Amino acid sequence: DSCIQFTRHASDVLLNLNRLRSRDILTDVVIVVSREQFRAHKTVLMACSGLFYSIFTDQLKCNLSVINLDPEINPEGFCILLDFMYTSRLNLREGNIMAVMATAMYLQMEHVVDTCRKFIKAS
Amino acid sequence: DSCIQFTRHASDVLLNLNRLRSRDILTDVVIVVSREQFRAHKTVLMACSGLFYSIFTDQLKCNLSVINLDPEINPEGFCILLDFMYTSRLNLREGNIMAVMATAMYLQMEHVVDTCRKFIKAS
Amino acid sequence: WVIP
Amino acid sequence: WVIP
Ligand SMILES: CN(C)c1ncc(Cl)c(Nc2ccc3c(c2)CC(=O)N3)n1
Ligand SMILES: CN(C)c1ncc(Cl)c(Nc2ccc3c(c2)CC(=O)N3)n1
Ligand SMILES: [Cl-]
Ligand SMILES: [Cl-]
């Protein structure tokens, strides 16, 4: 086509979606990880995760307001990945890299799994 | 912070949100423009438009499944702007630039209004 | 704005 | 991935 493109548009959209999340605006699901609860937008979860994409395209699960993750999933690893979904920024540290990689493999977030594998290989 | 960043994350999120829109997955509102109906995600509309942001943060309107725009709004100008919201690509042409600028001013999409003003000034 |  |  003969379209023009606004370079910062996608980043600005994501920044505003994170602002809605921080104010709990139009969040439509709560993700339960052990005792911890995380409010989010189903569409953002689907756009970032192969697991949420499969869950919310399912004719029955698409209507659930509460999703319980496998008890092996660490709430801190999930929190770091949820923050990544809404910001593109990953808080990867020596003390969390194993929990982050395991959570990303479960959530099916291929690019996060790839950087965790590379960072582990380096050490 | 000591975060790492995935450069393509925001663009990949937006591409997946557009894929959900094209398949009509988790769309929660229909925008009526004259006779034409457009299905979309409230969160994406809010993230892109000052008008939708005001509408869906309103305690009563946040619950509406149908939003009717002012009858002066052109359905083609709206379609071009809705496509821009989900792709960062604006199909700006000599034959549509006036309708696109008027719709962007109404929707409060400041960056689109700015490029329309510059393109009109050049001609 | 750019030419994509 | 980059250092932002
Ligand atoms: C694959 N597909 C057509 C598609 N359409 C829409 C959405 Cl929201 C979606 N999201 C999704 C699927 C798989 C994966 C991801 C998002 C991230 C990932 O690593 N794998 N995937
Ligand atoms: C202004 N603010 C705190 C905010 N938070 C969340 C959202 Cl979704 C939002 N969106 C929005 C508001 C105003 C404008 C836009 C989006 C685009 C624009 O040109 N003006 N604005
Ligand atoms: Cl990823
Ligand atoms: Cl804009």
Distance CA B110, CA B52 (A): 13
Q: Cα separations (Å) of B94 from A2, B88, B109, B120?
A: 12, 19, 19, 9
Of A25, A107, A109, residue with least CA distance to A67: A107
Q: What is the dihedral of CA A76, A81, A87, A91, to 10 degrees?
A: 60
Question: Structurally, how many domains does chain A consist of?
Answer: 1
Measured in residues, chain A has a length of 123
CA-nearest residue to D4 within chain A is: A89
- How many CA atoms does the CB half-sphere of B40 hold within 13 Å? 26
- Token pair recorded at residue A63: 């209507």
Start-end of H helices in chain B: 9-22, 42-48, 50-56, 75-87, 97-107, 110-122
Instruction: Name the DSSP class of B26.
Output: S
Q: What pairing do the DSSP bridges indicate for beta strands B66-68 and B29-33? A: parallel
What are the φ/ψ torsions at residue A90 (nearest 5 degrees)? -110, 120
Distance CA A12, CA B105 (A): 18
The answer to whether chain B touches chain A by having 3 or more C-beta pairs less than 8 angstroms apart is: yes
Q: What pairing do the DSSP bridges indicate for beta strands A66-68 and A36-40? A: unpaired
Range of the domain at A20: 1-123
Q: Is B85 in the pocket of ligand 2 (CB under 6 A)?
A: no
**Method for structure elucidation:** X-ray
CB contact under 8 A, C1 and B115: yes
| CATH assignment at residue A4 | 3.30.710.10
CB-based contact A61:A21 (threshold 8 Å) = no
CB contact under 8 A, D4 and A89: yes
DSSP for chain A, written as a single string: ---EE-TTHHHHHHHHHHHHHHTT-S--EEEEETTEEEEE-HHHHHHH-HHHHHHHTSTTGGG-SEEEPPTTS-HHHHHHHHHHHHHSEE---TTTHHHHHHHHHHHT-HHHHHHHHHHHHH-
SS3 B93: coil
Quick one: CA dihedral A29, A21, A47, A52, positive or negative? negative
Of B21, A14, A37, residue with least CA distance to A29: A37
Q: Cα separations (Å) of A90 from A15, A52, A108, B52?
A: 15, 19, 15, 30
